[model samples]
Target: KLAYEKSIEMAGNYANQFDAQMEANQAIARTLACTMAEYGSQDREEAMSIIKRILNENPQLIGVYLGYEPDAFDGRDKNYINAPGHDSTGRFVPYCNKINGPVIIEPLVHYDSSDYYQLPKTTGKDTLTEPYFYEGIFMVSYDSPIFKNGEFAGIAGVDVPLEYVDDVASSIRTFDTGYAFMVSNTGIFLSHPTQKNWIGEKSLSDFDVEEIKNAASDIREGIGGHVEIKDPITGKTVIMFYEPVKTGDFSFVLVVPKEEML
Candidate 1:
């Protein structure tokens, strides 16, 4: 009879532990999502300023902005190759030479690169349209058509690294189960917690199960939310929370397992 009672007590404790873990996971997810959105918005603005300063100083260098390597010009000069900052090599050269006029560069910006050079034409007077790239390790840059003395000059703009933005997502949490990650609306993983595997390769299709699909759709609506679902890739049940990155329409997600806190 004593053994039976002990077994019953153990089962009760296990149940309580499971419930506690679930509650804790949900709370953590909520906190992380809110914090990421707030910090991400601020960081995006700061990044914009940093890029703008680079353009203001070198207004003539706008044509060289590389959508794939936005930060290639950071701390660089007109002769970027010999500039004090990092070198612009192989894939970086083509985009660098594409600059021709006044341009506005957005770091971690999204653009459609297939038709790389055709500028966009938007209906909104305040909105400027141009060729764009989206969801890659590369940053998107917009080269505006320059008009000086009522005549065209060239392109002038800025470019920012995606990794820098990923660092902003990293500041919110310290969890063992897994780290925070951000993705595009198309499901491409933009940032991962592992620095070595920075810009690690993965796609949303891998985890596009019913629940994940619903979550992704929620993110598309741009009204960040949280959900209790299983990770299709890891097969672990986690509380997934996400919000828009604020500066752009991209999304950020934070995951915590239901078993960890218990």
Candidate 2:
């Protein structure tokens, strides 16, 4: 009983901490959008410098970026065709990252259809992207739309490494052989101690465990609680404590074997 109670307490605390970090990342994207709104169209060099500074200042950010609409950045898209800091179409889509040990700039390859860019552009609201694997690391993006004189101008955003989140999720321990796992808002497993291959690849519904299968359905319905079921992996009965990462739309579950209670 005490183990179950304590595990539930830890689950809530972990979710809250994760939510707070996500909010902080979203705030950066919002602030960048607001800055662009105030300054209006900026020169390519000026915009690039801003993102570079953002990357340098935020240690947690893997990348900082801005993608401008055609002819919106400076009304000079035709003049910079195939130029540095500009894609083949001459749009300003500067992506600054420190992944190589030194800050570098690159043009976004697929700004038109990529979720990180398209979601905000089409919805006209700030958004956090689902977890995705990129360049050997799992990550998520926070993006905010930029508006100019009541016109959709572009997007500005930041990338956060999911390893940090997974670290916290994998750190929780409840009893012998018990561990924690996290699911994204869409029910996709983002972190699981023994399900590394499933991260970003599978959802909770795909699992065969009855307790987990039920948890999957409940998560989709935005419900939260605890359940008990036989663990196929450990061959013992266990209790699962779960809750949503507040405002995150994600779930955190800690599975503890029942033997600890005995």
Candidate 3:
């Protein structure tokens, strides 16, 4: 019975941590969203130029740009190589080929494939599409259509490696023991303690849990808050705190293990 009591205590502690982390995550997201929006709007050209300048000033920032689509050779013009020092033959090689951008960016987080794909032509808005998962890196991407002189030019955006976010999650602690990680409300691990194993996997929906199914439904409704859940894969109890991505309504969940807090 002591274990049961401990479980209860741990569950409660986890719930508290979930709540606190939710508040903190929401605040951080809001602040960053506002700041990034300002940066994106103040001058997109200058913003990208500044990013390039930073990369030039500190080569370390190049890692952050490694998997970035805008900086990639695939989508860029033949002559548009963003990185410095290329083969005289004018052949473009991706930076990630040499350095593991995924490892250096975030140990657990990865990029979703949807970031790279143009939306399908189908009209099934409710379709559950598979996420493209990059091993070892977490990415945050945004899409904004560019209008030049009232004509649609293309899309402009940026990618943020998950480590920057992990740094934020690591800052919030609980009773000197608890920590937080973010995921998709759909349960696909976003940034987690064990990101490598869980990233890109379907959420608890795969287990067909009624509670999780219901929660998933609610998440689609743009709800953002805390919920208790049983991990389908591990059967471990956890608390999820999350909010919908403002730009896409993609779920963003923060999870805390229920056993650790007690």
Candidate 4:
């Protein structure tokens, strides 16, 4: 009985810690967008240098990617084909990262289909993408739109590998088998200890239990509290305490088995 209260408190505590890290990533994206807006329609030389600097300076970031609309960056896209800082299509879609020991500069592949580029352009708002596999790693991106003259010019983004948050969630423990997990605003599982494969690929809706689904739905609706439900993995009764992360539409949950309470 008392263990439930402890789990609920831990949920809020862990969420607060993770939210701080998420806010740091958002600050970087905001800074990049503001800089790009100020340097609107300029040469890519300074922009590329800044991107490289941001990637190198931020140890937490795995990549920094930016995309511009057709000729929105500069009128010299036609001249920069297959050139440095420009992709094959003469577009400014630089993706700088430290996947290798040294920072690597490459063009963003599949920019047309990537949400990091499309979401900000279409919605005209800053976005925090759900975790996805990229560059041989699971990562999420914080993207901010660069608006020039009241029109969407491009997007400035920073990538943070999910491992940072995953490790934090996995470190939390309660009773004998209780653990912690995280979910996106839409209830997509971002981190799971035993269900490693479900991270980024599945959501609470896929749970085998109906009560778990309703509990997750309430979480998405910004309702936070305790829910007693059958564990989908362990097949045991468990009490789940959840709290929303403040930086974005995400939540942190702590699960404690009923057996541990007795």
Candidate 5:
């Protein structure tokens, strides 16, 4: 209990810090949207200029962009502005971490099926899309909808990284039969002691550990404390503790084999 619990603490520390940054960046997106909204067809130049200034700051922020409804700013710029890039194969958000600085002119890439397009379009509100591998990096997209006179004009957002979680997850190796792993707020596996391909591909429930289904299904939250679920792989009951990075949308879960620890 003591050692595994300590491992949980260490893993949660990095997960929480990562989420805190996303939460803070959401606030930044809100402010950015409000300020950028001051421009429409008449001053899309000002909007692009504002983005240029934003890119100049915020170093660690990976990708930054604003997506608009079809031809929303064509009249102002005589050209349509599209979101920076998107998932080409519907779910394949190619990894492109080479961008050392912010993109000023705003290049266009197709994101027709991405949450960067779907979330803001469907919900008409700010959203944090699911985690996926893009250019080999694991990250999430948080977007704030842009409205012009109550119409959904577009979305403004940024991409946040989870690469640090890999380092934190690696530490969980301290256990043997008592292994550890992590899941997203939606239960997507962000870290696993085994399964290299499972990181962004599977969710906790998909593994079908019936003992903790109740705790895992709670959409409102999964943090307050911990749960004990039978390990499907080891077929032994394991103690699991889940904590929100406070993101409420993204989270991390730590699991340890019961028999090995005892």
Candidate 6:
């Protein structure tokens, strides 16, 4: 209980700030709208230049970009001046940054493929999304719609990497021999030290273990508990404790081999 609960608290601390970040992105979106409206189609270079400053100011901010409303920014007397860099297939290679510095601006794909597009186009509201594997890295996006003169101009948002969550969750040991991992509310493993290949592929249902199967159902129903199960491979009894991650649509699950209780 202590270990999983602590994980929840740690997760919640980060989650508490999620709203603030989204709000910040909203403010940034507004700024983008005003900047585009003022500059029109005249200074593409300057608009692109300002994006770097936006990212530089927020250390956690990984990326930011303006998505046009299919010429809405240009058709109206109000013009979206900045043109995002694209590649051969015309994918969006917009403003992005990494660990050390800015990466080669390659297209992050679109709404369906990348976190940059889909939701903002359909929802027209501030939206936060799940971690998406982009460029072989796991990251999440916060997008807010840009409305000009009461119409949807496009979208503006940012992305943040999530590798550290794995480091933390994996280190949170309990019962000494106990191990912990993380899963999406959907039961997709987010971080697993044992079954590395299961991180993105296997769901709880794939386990063929009762505790895991039940935990899967309970999680979907927003329940948490400790369920005892026997390891199929080792033929040893173990207790699996699973809890919902307060941060996002993820679950914190800890496992303690029964003998460790001794």
How many pairs of residues collide in model 1?
A: 19
Model 6 misplacement above 4 A: 1-46, 58-61, 74-93, 99-101, 104-108, 112-116, 220-223, 232-235, 258-262
Q: For each candidate in the order shown, give its overall lDDT on alpha carbons.
A: 0.41, 0.82, 0.40, 0.83, 0.62, 0.61
Q: How far is candidate 4 from the true structure (C-alpha RMSD, Å)?
A: 2.4
When 4 and 5 are scored with TM-score, the better candidate is 4
lDDT (tens digit, per residue) of candidate 5 on 1-262: 5766686685577567667767787877767667556664445445556655665576556766776665454332323323333222222122223354435453435556776767777888887777887766787777887777778766777777766666667555435655455567778877776677888897776755565675567522655356777655767787776666666455565666667666
Pairs that clash in candidate 2: none
**Prediction RMSDs, each to the true structure:** 15.4, 2.2, 9.8, 2.4, 5.6, 5.1
Give me the displacement of residue 40 in model 6, in angstroms. Answer: 8.4
User: Using Cα atoms with residue i matched to residue i, what is each candidate's TM-score against the true structure?
Assistant: 0.45, 0.90, 0.46, 0.90, 0.72, 0.68
| Candidate 4 residue lDDT tens string, 7-124 | 7777888888888989999999988998888885586877888899998888999889778887878867888899875677888888898876578888887668878888898999
Residue range 1-262, candidate 3, lDDT tens digits: 4533444354344434434533433343233323333332433234345434433443322222212223222333345333342322222221211135322212111222343223211221111222333445454433333333333223332333445444554455543444554445454555455454555555645556666666566566656555677776888776555555443344545455667643
For residue 100, what is the lDDT in candidate 1? 30
Write candidate 1's Cα lDDT for 26-96 as tens digits. Answer: 23323322332233232323433444444455433232332223322232223344322223331112232
True-vs-predicted CA distance for residue 54, candidate 4, Å: 0.7
Best by lDDT: 4
Error of 5 at 144 (Å): 0.2
For model 2, residues 1-262, the per-residue Cα lDDT tens digits are: 6666677788788778778878888999899988987775566788888889888888999999988899877888888787876678988888898766678888887888898889888889898888888777788889999998987899999988888767777877765778888888777988888767888999978877787788877776666778888866768888777788755578888877778755
Q: What's the lDDT of the predicted structure labeled candidate 5?
A: 0.62
Measured with C-alpha atoms, the lDDT of residue 64 in candidate 5 is 65
